[PDB]
Amino acid sequence: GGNYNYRYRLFRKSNLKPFERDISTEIYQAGSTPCNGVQGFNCYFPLQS
Amino acid sequence: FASVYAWNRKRISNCVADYSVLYNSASFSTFKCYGVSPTKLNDLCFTNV
């Protein structure tokens, strides 16, 4: 039926640290406009299934 | 513009391309790159576009 519960981080401000956990789920601004929690233009969800 | 079967092919070289002014433009329906993140094209150096 398609396994969609498995997700991975796709975007971040910078690279992680060794043995560091990131669980924060916030919209990421890919461009020059604020997102304000809207996944629109230049705004993306960091998690991908 | 030419047709899809006769797609217009253009060679550009010996130029400085400011992809930022195309990136921040919202008039584009789709702005999607494969091998490179769109934010670092201005940070890459190539030839024979």
Curated annotation (Swiss-Prot), chain B:
It comes from the Viruses. Changing residue 25 to L: In strain: Omicron/BA.1. Changing residue 30 to A: In strain: Omicron/BA.2, Omicron/BA.2.12.1, Omicron/BA.4, Omicron/BA.5, Omicron/BQ.1.1, Omicron/XBB.1.5, Omicron/EG.5.1. Changing residue 22 to I: In strain: Omicron/XBB.1.5, Omicron/EG.5.1. Changing residue 27 to P: In strain: Omicron/BA.1, Omicron/BA.2, Omicron/BA.2.12.1, Omicron/BA.2.75, Omicron/BA.4, Omicron/BA.5, Omicron/BQ.1.1, Omicron/XBB.1.5, Omicron/EG.5.1. Attaches the virion to the cell membrane by interacting with host receptor, initiating the infection. The major receptor is host ACE2. When S2/S2' has been cleaved, binding to the receptor triggers direct fusion at the cell membrane. When S2/S2' has not been cleaved, binding to the receptor results in internalization of the virus by endocytosis using host TFRC and GRM2 and leading to fusion of the virion membrane with the host endosomal membrane. Alternatively, may use NRP1/NRP2 and integrin as entry receptors. Binds to host ACE2. RBD also interacts with the N-linked glycan on 'Asn-90' of ACE2. Cleavage of S generates a polybasic C-terminal sequence on S1 that binds to host Neuropilin-1 (NRP1) and Neuropilin-2 (NRP2) receptors. Interacts with host integrin alpha-5/beta-1 (ITGA5:ITGB1) and with ACE2 in complex with integrin alpha-5/beta-1 (ITGA5:ITGB1). May interact via cytoplasmic c-terminus with M protein. May interact (via N-terminus) with host bilirubin and biliverdin, thereby preventing antibody binding to the SARS-CoV-2 spike NTD via an allosteric mechanism. This is Spike protein S1. It comes from Severe acute respiratory syndrome coronavirus 2. The lineage of its organism: Viruses, Riboviria, Orthornavirae, Pisuviricota, Pisoniviricetes. The chain holds residues 347 to 395 of 1273 of the full protein.
